[PDB]
Amino acid sequence: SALFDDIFTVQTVDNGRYNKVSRIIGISTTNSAIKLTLDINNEMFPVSQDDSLTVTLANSLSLKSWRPPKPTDKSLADDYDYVMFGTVYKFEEGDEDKIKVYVSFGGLLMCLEGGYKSLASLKQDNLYILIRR
Amino acid sequence: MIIPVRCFSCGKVVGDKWDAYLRLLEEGKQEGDALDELKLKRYCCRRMVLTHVDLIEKFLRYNPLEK
Amino acid sequence: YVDGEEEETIMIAMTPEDLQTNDTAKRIKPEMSTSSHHTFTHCEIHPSMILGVAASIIPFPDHNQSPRNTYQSAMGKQAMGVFLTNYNVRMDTMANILYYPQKPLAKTQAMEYLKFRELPAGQNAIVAIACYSGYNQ
Amino acid sequence: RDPTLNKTVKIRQGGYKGKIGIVKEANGDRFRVELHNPNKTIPIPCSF
Amino acid sequence: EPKVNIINAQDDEVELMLSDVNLSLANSLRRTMLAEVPTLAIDLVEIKMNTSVLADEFISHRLGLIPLVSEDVEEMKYSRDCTCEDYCDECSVVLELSARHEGEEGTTDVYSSSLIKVSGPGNLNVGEPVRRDDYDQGILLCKLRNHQELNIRCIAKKGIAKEHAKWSPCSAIAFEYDPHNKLKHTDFWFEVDAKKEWPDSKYATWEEPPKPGEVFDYKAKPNRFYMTVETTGSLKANQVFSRGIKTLQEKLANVLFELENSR
Amino acid sequence: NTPIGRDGKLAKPRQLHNTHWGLVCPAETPEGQACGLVKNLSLLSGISI
Amino acid sequence: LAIENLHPDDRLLLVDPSPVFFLRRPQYVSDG
Amino acid sequence: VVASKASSSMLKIDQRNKKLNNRFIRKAEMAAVEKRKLR
Amino acid sequence: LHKMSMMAHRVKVMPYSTFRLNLSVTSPYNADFDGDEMNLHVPQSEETRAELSQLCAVPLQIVSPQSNKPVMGIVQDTLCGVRKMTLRDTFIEYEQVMNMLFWVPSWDGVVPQPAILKPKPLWTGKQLLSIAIPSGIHLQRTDGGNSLLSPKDNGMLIVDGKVMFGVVDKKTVGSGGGGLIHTVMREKGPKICAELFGNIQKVVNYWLLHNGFSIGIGDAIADASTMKEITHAISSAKEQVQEIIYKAQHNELELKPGMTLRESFEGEVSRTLNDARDSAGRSAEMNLKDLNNVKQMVSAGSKGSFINIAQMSACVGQQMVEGKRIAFGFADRSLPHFTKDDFSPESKGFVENSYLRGLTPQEFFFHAMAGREGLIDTAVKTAETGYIQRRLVK
Amino acid sequence: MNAPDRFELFILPDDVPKLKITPDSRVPNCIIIKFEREDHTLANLLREELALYPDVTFVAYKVEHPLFANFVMRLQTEEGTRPKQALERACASIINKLKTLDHKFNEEWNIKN
Amino acid sequence: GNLMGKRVDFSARTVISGDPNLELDQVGVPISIAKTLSYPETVTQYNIHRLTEYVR
Amino acid sequence: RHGQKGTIGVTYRHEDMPFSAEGIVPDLIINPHAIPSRMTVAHLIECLLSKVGSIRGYEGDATPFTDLTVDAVSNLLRDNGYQSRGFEVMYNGHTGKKLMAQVFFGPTYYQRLRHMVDDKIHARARGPVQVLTRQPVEGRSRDGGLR
RNA sequence: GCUUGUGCUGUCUUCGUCCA
Ligand SMILES: [Mg+2]
Ligand SMILES: [Zn+2]
Ligand SMILES: [Zn+2]
């Protein structure tokens, strides 16, 4: 079902030029050297410095034309506060245990740096990012 | 030439207020105060009466061509 | 009166305020510090009198690029207004008359002597500056 | 030759009812009538 | 579910508040009142003599723009839908103006009160030019000096502002919602501070300003709409509002009839 | 009007000169071939008799 | 009498709940 | 001439406006030049 | 002037008395809608119709042989709107998304998944633009050595016809070589390229119609701190020019080789004044916010440049006649309002005010002299250029 | 000279139907409706009424050219419901809303007069 | 003036306007210009009905 | 009056034009792209001063080389209850929703020029020819052809 | 018994329009 789970602490929140988009940098509590850079929508999911986020990555939401979800049906997204859908445009096989995954959620960019052991399963075309706080 | 019947922008009838405007200006009221008295609030309507030039008074000074 | 040849021997103040010795919106005047003192012989009556008939119609010409002033001086002679008040008794080859001439809301002092308020050649339109539907590109 | 050429006519039906005109061309039933105020000429059947 | 609240009421203007309606419904009502409510206006002018200093089409255009009483115009028929020959009493109103200057000095003004109704529908309140009072002279039409006369015969027909703006019952419809910009439908241009560089709306006191610690509500929609309807005198404001609603209902019913007949 | 013609045209007669100040309009001039050759009198200008 | 003839302290009591040189009052005959 | 009533009224308005302009514009210009001088 | 001034179009019969053009073909014709007129020629034979439709048709003329780059691009408010709509913080709701998707003629009927699914479904402008891009298109550009995370949203990356990052602007949908139009023309052919023009124009025009864009007097007004900085820069430059004048008047000036003392002095003063105008303009342009409308138009590449902002907001600068400062047309002075032998910047044609601030009469006259120079130069060189072109063709 | 008659904006020709419905076979249960002699006033009303229905999955409209008085609507519904029935329900619902709005306005006007 | 370039028939001229709702290779033509200009089409069995409708 | 010439591209009716909160619709919509390259700041200053004059009932003095500044006009406009820089909140005519951007809005003096499209439109299929060359004649009045 | 008619100057000059 899911491909990756972890808990991060936000080191920095960079608003920059934009009013609705912020770039956050986080590091996994359990396993260091696993970094996360992510663009999020401030209005619908505001985050502050030193917050704790539960980030989950999945290739599907189950338990081609989009339609508004019926209230009756249920999906993985019901457990989280913020869900995005993107495409992986670069899977970098770099150093011995340095793997970078670049995802683009409609122009909102994410880079997940980590080891091959954790990120081996992230070699997909599309990914969902589910965030809980 | 002669005061337009309607305001160009919104179409309020301004063609019945020319003589009252001249009367108010005769009494000594300022142009803005006179326009306020005639209930012309939007500046589109105020432009119609404030910038009108009455050319028909010059055209009427020529003798009639048919009698 | 002075002609162009006699102008080479006189010293002219631009304004009567120039005869006696930090705002971001007001224009800045020359210092003229090269001379310790100045003995003016003449003074301009008003600097806006250097313009002709067609350029006296432009509002705020000192805030425009000069080719646009030239273009307006050309185009203002092709505007439709009321050329004479006796157009009904005249038999001209062509003649255009505007239904409802209006005097401008922004005017210059030179327009008083050009009779522009009595025989105007335009109308005050309410204008928005906007990309509405792509039909004004 | 029709007896209705260059004669003042009035329109009684359609979208131009009650407008005065002059017949300019008349070949087969589709009389061409110029309108006095709109500077235009319009086709119209003879019935109207 | 929809609610109406009236703030100010007059013969020629009403200021109301619409709530629990969609934005599209309010905008369609505004558009219908502006362009689709039928009135009565002069459409044909027969000029028997005109020796004034004004051109014939000039005077005809001025006559077209005079507002006439259109209270019973719903019972009248459209000229193209009337089977009659030429113009009859069921699809037109005939007015006549005859003016002249007597004397060899001075100038005579021709007002819209000089228009006299000669024929029209029986017992219907349509045709007379609108007048604010009994002593009001109306709209200035022309000016005459000695030996100048104007003699015309006008025909008033029913129509809508889509064909020509002379048939519009309204002048301007103010329209506004969300004075405090809680929905963030506009992004305010500023130099230093947007709050103090923009004037407050006239309905800003009708809604509670947002709290400083409040967060953006993404589930909200526009709910309350403020609008003022100003009329030219051809119809009263309540009449314009009711007939706009009726016109929208008739358009929807025509769509429904076409759908059911399509089978 | 300055009768210099079209043949042998040069920029120098068409130029706006320093001595034109207050005597001819710096703005009003035709576009094209007569640019700078046709001039218009300033508002307070006069001609000696 | 006018606003000028009013006492300065009473003029101070007239508070809106100065003319500028570039707002002229309109004319119809002009001059020249 | 036998001038019209509207034209005579406009002439009176023009005279009053000319006098008022000649007073107010000159006073405002004097206030502006003295303020620019004292700076 | 070139073979793209005559192209074959398809007729659509329409009311009113004007000819109607798509706005992307106004560049090869060098036409605008302020009074221009154009001619139309009707073929009278089957062979001639085939020649027009197979050789001279507009889609076949997109890429020109003169510079092996396109001559038609996205222009004017479509360019401004495509820059505004593809910003990172542009989000669109479901109803407007449905309207924009239905506006695309080549849309296949499948609505894409939103970028954000929870709490509220939101699409971005990049997705809606990618809908108008045909599949199988790959494009990659690097701006300022940006990385693959693109912190400033510059550069460009398109994968299978989908925009991954980068603001779409003149560098992507303009007429330059290596852009989206050139790639689509090479990969899919002229027909798909013309449909790409139509799709992009329709989507961006709808979004801009429902968003809005304006410009006002406040967009040329810089705050007080920047105006203080600009005034300080101009005053320091004038003091530098005064020092140069004193050095030249005391024989302490270095002579540029191959030039006289007067020529070197004039060149050095002109260089100082040009640097002053550039510095003041750079300060003014750095001051501007992102919401500034002039900045938005300049950044889209649709109209205006840096010099326009500099002259409108900070300083018009030095007026040049025949490549030199204003000459001494009177006896040793430029105007009778100066004294003799005056070499200060204001005496010889330096305009220190902006267009917003207003020019003084001396600056007005000098600026008019420079504009007259421009008009004469154009209206004189046109005939020589035409004669050279005719001889080359023959 | 080339200006069309102003009554052509709202008068329906004899040979031109008010309403033409064709299916859109690309996706299931979708129809394309062409409205003649109508504009944004009816289009926006119908679209934003239909967009709130749970069984309507897609609704949009476009006016192709402002010089022609027509618009085209695309409507897609769930498997159980047919798009024409949804359109009829939307028309009836807006009619009912306008009816109660008129009633309440008349009541309030009578109260305040 | 008469051999390398000349005046020709079947041509039109008028002012140009912009249209965001036209295709790249399309041109909008006034109805009067379309009535004035003509194309001679050969009558075949593929188009005789349409051509006689045009003639009517 | 600032060298900004143009032709009508389309006409819209009252209910289709954008409107302000008080119901005012423009008589004219011009593109923002005409302003920055031609640098006609006097157009915007004239529009602001005309808005102030029409609100207060005065005629604005636009004589060159005076002491007028944009900030004085802005202060006067602000005191009247409008945004000091001439911007207004506008609504879309088609939908009734607010526009995200605010629109510079005010009265400007325009003039109608002598060049009209119905005096220039001209088509020729066949017609009169010259006697000497048997080529089409010159001129729209003579039913001539194009060269 | 009564029937619908079938075309256009030349040569200069000036002022303009859109590019350049
Ligand atoms: Mg042009
Ligand atoms: Zn108005
Ligand atoms: Zn009848």
* All structural domains of chain E with their residue ranges: 1-38+166-263, 39-165
The phi and psi torsions of E112 (rounded to 5 degrees) equal: -70, -15
Q: Please name the residues in contact with J82: beta carbons below 8 A apart, sequence gap of 6 or more.
A: J29
Q: Are F29 and I372 in contact (CB under 8 A)?
A: yes
Q: Residue D21: exposed, middle, or buried by beta-carbon count in 10 A (0-12, 13-18, 19+)?
A: buried
Do the Cβ atoms of K39 and I197 come within 8 Å? Answer: no
CA C119 → C1' M1, Å?
A: 65
> Of all protein residues, which has its CA closest to the C1' atom of M2?
D1
I231/J14 Cα distance (integer angstroms): 73
Q: Longest Cα pair distance anywhere in chain B, in angstroms?
A: 45
Q: Is J27 on the interface with A (CB under 8 A)?
A: yes
CA J91 vs CA E20, E36, E243, J12, K41: distances in Å:
18, 19, 18, 21, 49
Regarding chains H and G, contact by 3 or more CB pairs under 8 A is answered as: yes
Strands C12-13, I317-318: pairing is unpaired
Cα–Cα dist I381/C67, whole Å: 18
**L42, C60: Cβ pair inside 8 Å?**
yes
The topology under which CATH files domain B1-66 is Arc Repressor Mutant, subunit A (1.10.10)
| Closest C1' nucleotide to L141's CA | M8
What are the structural domain ranges in chain B? 1-66
Backbone conformation region of residue E24, classed left if phi is above 0, alpha if psi is from -120 to 50, else beta: alpha
Q: Which CATH class is domain E1-38+166-263?
A: alpha beta
Chains K, H in contact: 3+ Cβ pairs under 8 A?
no
Element housing I19 (H / E)? strand I19-21
Q: Tell me, yes or no, if I77 comes closer than 8 A to chain C by beta carbon.
A: yes
Which CATH number does A1-133 carry?
2.40.50.140
Q: Which ligand is nearest to the CA of D12?
A: 3
Write out chain K residues lying below 8 Å of J2, CB-based: 30-32
The CA distance from I230 to I316, in Å, is 12
Closest nucleotide relative to residue I383's CA, C1' based: M20
Contacts of K32 in chain J (CB under 8 A): 1-2
End-to-end CA, chain G: 34
Contacts of J85 by beta carbon, 8 Å cutoff, 6+ apart: none
Please count the other Cβ atoms lying within 10 Å of the Cβ belonging to residue A100: 18
Q: Which residue of D has its CA nearest to J11?
A: D15
Q: Using an 8 Å CB-CB cutoff, list chain C residues near F42.
A: 49-52
Question: Can you list the domains of chain J with their CATH numbers?
Answer: 1-113 (3.30.1360.10)
Q: In Å, what is the CA distance from I15 to each residue of E120, I6, K26, L2? A: 38, 24, 15, 32
The top-level CATH class assigned to E39-165 is: mainly beta
Instruction: Say what the resolution is, in angstroms.
Output: 3.6
Task: Flag whether residue C132 sits within 8 Å of chain K, measured between CB atoms.
Answer: no
Residue L113, nucleotide of least CA–C1' distance: M17
- For every residue of J56-87, DSSP letters joined together read EEEEEEE-S-TTS-EEEEEEEE-SSS-HHHHH
Phi/psi region, residue I358 (left: phi>0; alpha: psi -120 to 50; beta: rest), is left
Please give the helix or strand (H or E) that residue H38 lies within, else none: helix H5-38
Distance M20 C1' – C78 CA (angstroms):
23
- Sign of the CA dihedral running I363, I365, I366, I368: positive
Q: Where are the alpha helices (DSSP H) in chain I?
A: 26-29, 46-55, 76-85, 94-103, 125-132, 170-173, 180-188, 190-211, 224-248, 261-287, 293-300, 306-313, 361-393
What stretch of H or E contains C75? Answer: helix C66-75
Ligand closest in space to the Cα of E157: 3
Contact residues for strand M with beta carbon within 7 Å = C 74-75, 78; D 1-2, 5; F 1, 30-32, 34, 38; I 30, 32, 34-36, 378-379, 381-382, 385; L 5, 115, 128, 130-131, 137, 142-143
Which residue of B lies nearest to L26 if distances are taken between CA atoms?
B9
Residues in chain D: 48
CA distances from A78 to E47, I48, I350 (A): 78, 66, 68
Residue J55 tokens, joined: 């069984």
Domain positions in chain A:
1-133
Which of L13, L89, L96 shows the shortest C-beta gap to E23?
Answer: L96
Which residues of chain E neighbour D14 with C-beta distances below 8 Å? 80
CB spacing of I221 vs E191 below 8 angstroms? yes
For residue I158, CA distances in Å to I123, I141, I155, I163, I223 come to: 18, 9, 10, 5, 40
The CB-based long-range contact list for C72-78 (8 Å cut-off, 24+ gap) reads C72/L1, C72/L2, C72/L3, C73/F25, C73/F27, C73/F28, C73/F29, C74/F28, C74/F30, C74/F31, C75/L3, C75/L5, C75/L111, C75/L113, C76/C121, C76/L1, C76/L111, C78/L113, C78/L114, C78/L115
Q: Which residues of F18-39 are buried (b: 16+ CB within 10 A; e: fewer)?
A: bbbbbbbbbbbbeeeeebbbeb
Distance CA C67, CA C74 (A): 11
- What secondary structure letter does DSSP report for I5? G
Distance of alpha carbon D12 from alpha carbon D21, whole angstroms: 12
Q: Where are the alpha helices (DSSP H) in chain L?
A: 35-38, 41-56, 70-79
Could you tell me which chains touch chain J, where touching means 3 or more CB pairs under 8 A? A, D, E, I, K, L
CA-CA distances (angstroms) from residue F5 to E142, F38, I179, I374, I384?
A: 53, 11, 50, 20, 18
Nucleotide nearest to I375 (CA to C1'): M20
The answer to whether J1 touches I16, Cβ cutoff 8 Å, is: no
Min Cα distance K38 → chain L (Å) is 7
**Single-letter amino acid, residue E8:** N
Ligand 3 centroid – CA D45 distance (Å): 20
In this structure, are residues L74 and L48 in contact, taking their beta carbons and an 8 Å threshold?
A: yes
Q: Which residues pair with E129 in a beta bridge?
A: E68
Helix, strand or coil for residue J39? coil
Taking C1' of M7 and every protein CA, the nearest residue is L128
Neighbours of E51 (CB within 10 A): 15
Determine contact: A43 vs chain E, CB below 8 A.
yes
Local structure of H17: helix, strand or coil: helix
Q: Does L53 touch chain G (CB under 8 A)?
A: yes
Burial of E165 (0-12, 13-18, 19+ CB in 10 A): middle
Q: Which two tokens stand for residue E84?
A: 């009659």
Domain range I78-211, CATH class: mainly alpha
Strand ranges in J1-113 using DSSP code E only, listed in sequence order: 19-23, 30-36, 56-62, 70-77
Mutating which of E7, E19, E22, E34 best tests the J interface, going by the most J Cβ atoms within 10 A?
E22
